Design a protein around this ligand. Structure first.
Ligand SMILES: Nc1nc2c(ncn2[C@H]2C[C@H](O)[C@@H](COP(=O)(O)O)O2)c(=O)[nH]1
Ligand SMILES: Nc1nc2c(ncn2[C@H]2C[C@H](O)[C@@H](COP(=O)(O)O)O2)c(=O)[nH]1
Ligand SMILES: [Mg+2]
Ligand SMILES: [Mg+2]
Lengths: 241, 231
């Protein structure tokens, strides 16, 4: 099995490459933001449970026929509540440093110190709450930035360890968005492929929308033409590995 | 940080190599069997409290002035309860596939099937219970063979990633005993270094480094310095 980490801003051709690889090769995929979306879909169902709030499922957090930039018109209190349920969920997958979950009859809550950092972080976010902003907030604003910078790489490692030994040719991580994820990837001997559209940018200022640095050893596919030109570049890049 | 997995049989000089590295470089060490001794020391403290059993601390589970071969005279029954408490401790570190821990008012226990597999497995162990047989039963008879072949390597992965930006030059795992664990180390980008003596062992695969301990300590030491040099 060959481990590949893909890197590319929105609409750079990176998502196209990911799909080209998944449909033309024996590949298994793992999304770093996978568990972010599972935790939010779970928290949401706990939050919108017996409310008149719309039912958002994993598919919607996946963006399947749902615009994740849609304003959900939520209050900072609602958002804090959701983040606390998302944390209780994640803590059952892998312990978040400094977080404890307590039960009061099917009512899960985090410890005060953790609940207090959630509150402070959320209270200072003035953006409107979309599925997209909730992903950015859970992933980065809270966890990476305040509890465990390597949590999402840790969950990828547990998955990889379950699968490195199977019959797939490739193991792809298509959504690398933080430099430290790239650092872990290079350390583990992953091939890092950047898909770049000559002089283009991310229309989101969140750190997870920023273009990742190209370091020595990284491969770069310049998407400066047609689609088959891209498909050819992909084929010849992989043929080499 | 360079990830190094050391391999070698008893008296090959593998242990001397881990020591020299730890003593001469910015290095941090992780034992795959660490959590095994921690869980047993935990499960032990909890069960020998109720009884008139010897008090074994994490210090004797480490074999620190204790013979881990020492028979403890346990009922397959107590061994089974010790084992379930240890699963409870480990499950809080990283979930063991197919195990759920529940609180019974000042008493967590594992779901029934996990409980049932534990009993079945501990019931065919016809041996005598030393601390050392307990480590094996927990580590291999149970977890690796019946729950998750990769569980000890998953716990190393959590710790390695945790130390990822810590400033150490090397991360050394010295006690790998299974080949599947060495496969996982290679899959995670480790350099495998075998310490062998001229005339059981894990296989030496293509890419692994081999240090032949055929001379003196200072010669062993010199071979280690030059091997670390080209990593
Ligand atoms: N890769 C990654 N994504 C993160 C992190 N924290 C938050 N996210 C966000 C970035 C994306 O907006 C999102 C997943 O969205 P998408 O890949 O489009 O389903 O999760 C992090 O640490 N790593
Ligand atoms: N590395 C490793 N050690 C294991 C595993 N299962 C059980 N062990 C235990 C059995 C040995 O007696 C013990 C070594 O403990 P020590 O003497 O403190 O280094 O490791 C396993 O899967 N991997
Ligand atoms: Mg909950
Ligand atoms: Mg316990």
């Amino acid at each position: 099995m060959k481990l590949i980490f893909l890197s590319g801003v929105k609409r750079s051709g990176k998502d196209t490459t990911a799909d080209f690889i998944m449909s033309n090769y024996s590949a298994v995929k793992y999304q770093l933001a996978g568990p972010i979306k599972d935790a939010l879909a779970y928290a949401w169902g706990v939050f919108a449970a017996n409310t008149d709030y719309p039912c958002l499922t994993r598919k919607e957090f996946e963006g399947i026929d749902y615009d994740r930039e849609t304003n959900l018109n939520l209050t900072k209190l609602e958002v804090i509540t959701i983040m606390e349920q998302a944390f209780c969920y994640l803590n059952g997958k892998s312990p978040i440093k400094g977080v404890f979950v307590f039960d009061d009859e099917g009512k899960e809550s985090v410890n005060f110190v953790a609940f207090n950092k959630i509150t402070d972080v959320i209270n200072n976010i003035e953006d409107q709450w979309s599925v997209r902003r909730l992903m950015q907030a859970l992933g980065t604003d809270l966890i990476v930035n305040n509890f465990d910078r390597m949590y999402w790489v840790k969950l990828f490692a547990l998955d990889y360890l379950d699968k490195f030994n199977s019959g797939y040719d490739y193991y792809i991580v298509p959504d690398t968005r933080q430099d430290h994820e790239m650092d872990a990837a290079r350390a583990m001997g992953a091939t890092v492929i950047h898909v770049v559209r000559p002089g283009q940018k991310s229309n989101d200022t969140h750190i997870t929308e920023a273009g990742l640095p190209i370091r020595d050893g990284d491969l770069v596919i310049t998407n400066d033409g047609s689609l088959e030109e891209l498909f050819s570049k992909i084929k010849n890049t992989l043929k080499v590995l």
